[PDB]
Amino acid sequence: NAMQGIHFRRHYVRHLPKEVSQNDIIKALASPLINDGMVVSDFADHVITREQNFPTGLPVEPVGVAIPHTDSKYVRQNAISVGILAEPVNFEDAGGEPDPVPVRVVFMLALGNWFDITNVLWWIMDVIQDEDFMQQLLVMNDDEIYQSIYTRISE
Amino acid sequence: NAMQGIHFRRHYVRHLPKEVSQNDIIKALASPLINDGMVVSDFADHVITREQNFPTGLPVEPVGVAIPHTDSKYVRQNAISVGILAEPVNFEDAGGEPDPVPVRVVFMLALGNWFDITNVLWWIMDVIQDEDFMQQLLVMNDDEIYQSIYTRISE
Amino acid sequence: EIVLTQSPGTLSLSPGERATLSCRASQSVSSSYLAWYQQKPGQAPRLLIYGASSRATGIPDRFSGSGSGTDFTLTISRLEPEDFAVYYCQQYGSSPSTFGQGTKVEIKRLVPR
Amino acid sequence: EIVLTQSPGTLSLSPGERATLSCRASQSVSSSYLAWYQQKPGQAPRLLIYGASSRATGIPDRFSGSGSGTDFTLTISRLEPEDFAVYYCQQYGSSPSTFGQGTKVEIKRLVPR
Amino acid sequence: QVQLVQSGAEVKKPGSSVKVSCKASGGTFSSYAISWVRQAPGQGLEWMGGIIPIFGTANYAQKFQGRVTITADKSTSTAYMELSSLRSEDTAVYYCAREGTTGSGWLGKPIGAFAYWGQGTLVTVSS
Amino acid sequence: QVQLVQSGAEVKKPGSSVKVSCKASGGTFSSYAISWVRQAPGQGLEWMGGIIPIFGTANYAQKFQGRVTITADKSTSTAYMELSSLRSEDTAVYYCAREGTTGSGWLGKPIGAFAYWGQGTLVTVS
């Protein structure tokens, strides 16, 4: 499976308040990963730096997505966390276009193996093309989201 | 034609009696080529040196053949010179085997183009497949031999 | 750094015979991250097996991979002339990817010259 | 020796177009002894034309050889991206065989984005 | 298949730098990992590093970090390897390679292992 | 469908010699011309010399006379090129090549031009 070895908990699914900045999002999604020992304690700083220099916005619509991550050397165990935003927050387009991506769904990746990154990207790209499912993510509670993603993780 | 550009005269056919040594066979077949300016004047010396070190006897049936020649740089115009030996004369085997080749028919080659050698070799190996033709070479006179070979050169 | 040690160094076999090649890893590698390549002299490597046991697209059935943990095997069930070559294993379970040193599969001489 | 001079040195054309490559000899060469080769990057040369105008086995009609004496031509019709290569003429009318310096054929994008 | 075509042989002096290109055609570029691999003549294969173009940042083997720079130009589907401060010991054939995918089509699941290889680029360094 | 298979790449020290092999299969060895052609990195093709195995001795381009030895061994259907006193300038890919033929079978009329090529052998001089 593309998502073999990736740890995922209900505790890794977060609805974030409408106030949040991009940095706020990264810190909040990092939090449960740090405290489960999945990443280095300054993981959030390293993802923030990466995002500034090599952005991870994917210009899908009507639900924009971002895939923030950093160097695998900052990861101790494989995990993903998921942020649902109440209002869009701009991420820059990974493809290099000047127009921002209004993001509502954030997949933070903590992957310890560089050679596994494209597997998870491929899986994400597959997931976010169910238009109905992306819509559902904006209204589903954390348990509904956990189960829906867990099902998709398990092929 | 495989024999394109190869000069051949009645005077390039002779019978050699049983007394003649390998070296003097080579000198005899060289002689008319030298007179006609087809090769350098010490051509025979170079063919002898070649034969001594890289022999040209072919153990074909039923009549043994040799194909003495030397470096193309010693050739001025393309020619073949043919010898019929009254009795078998041993040439060493071109393919490096220890046993001598009893030769009766000698095709001396004077070719200015190294890249044409395998063409002429092909023609020789083709012509000699006619067992009846090879037998006739041992009994025909010089005029008959000339016409027979001329025909096979011409087409 | 994960070291891959291949054995034997050299394998001398006739066409039609089975070749059995080993790749030993200094640490456990997940089966999902072990590959085998063929390389002929003066040519680029060619992928044979990925994920320890999956044949790459177009690769003939006579090539098969197996194993897990520290111990992996490439089998060529019936050697063709075209199979005599160097074979490498590779792990890509972490950065940096590392390769074994290669096993040379060479044709046996039958008649002493 | 006999010198072969190819022109142009580089030829940049659009896909689908007709390419004309020239090979000029310093003295007359019998047409029986003039060949053309295609060398794609990282490959051995591939024989296209021999004896000036004869296509080698498997070579399609869109490669065409012509000329005589001191002036020979290779024509490539319906140019393909895959035709990216250096093309060499060769004479083998005596030792040593000599080669032209090659014409590098490049295929442009039909229309840059 | 995906085709990978590299730039031609480089004949270099010590202390110089070289930049080798790897142009991909016949498949997807953005979302699949491209690596660079070194092979000294008659010797084994060494992974230098790689890049996933859409994410923009290269990953390096420690051995090669800080003399090797790997980049990708999404607009031309071309990856690059730049080697600086060349020495004679750098003489080798350099390959780009791209991971394979599963199944039919161009956006299949990636396999990590290198299904596609460039033709190689010789860099010589001497004198 | 003649196949020419060459020996592997070699790194050589200045002054040394290298012997490259070229095994020919899928057709006739003895009576067809095999050539050696070298290509310095990024440069053009140079004919070094050639051999018709049955006649034992090679023909050399004079630039290579006395440093190159070309031989053939019928028992293994293999041709060789040995280059001595190697210098920096000898760094190159070395190809063997063999003339084509016409007609059916393996004993057809030769065409001189190089229809068949080995994969090349890289020699670097360190």
Residue numbers in the entry:
A (entry chain S), B (entry chain T): 7 to 161
C (entry chain L), D (entry chain M): 1 to 27, 27A, 28 to 112
E (entry chain H), F (entry chain I): 1 to 52, 52A, 53 to 82, 82A, 82B, 82C, 83 to 100, 100A, ...
Text taken from the publication that reported this structure:
Five GEPs (1, 2, 3, 7 and 8) bind T117 with nearly identical behavior, including GEP 1 and GEP 7, which differ only by alternate J segment utilization, showing that the two incorporated mutations did not affect binding, so no further IGHJ1*01 GEPs were produced for study. Only six of the 35 predicted somatic mutations affect sequence positions making direct contacts to the core epitope: Y/K32L, S/Q93L, T/S31H, I/V51H, F/L54H and T/I56H. Replacements at three other positions (31H, 54H, 56H) nearly perfectly recapitulated contacts, also conserving the interface. Only two somatic mutations were predicted to contribute to a stronger binding interaction. The Y/K32L mutation replaces a hydrogen bond involving the tyrosine hydroxyl with a salt bridge.
An effective HIV vaccine will likely need to elicit broadly-neutralizing antibodies (bnAbs) that target the viral envelope protein (Env) as part of a protective immune response. GEPs showed detectable, but extremely weak, binding to soluble Env gp140s and extremely limited neutralization potency, though some reverse engineered epitope-scaffolds (ESs) showed robust GEP affinities, well above the B cell activation threshold.
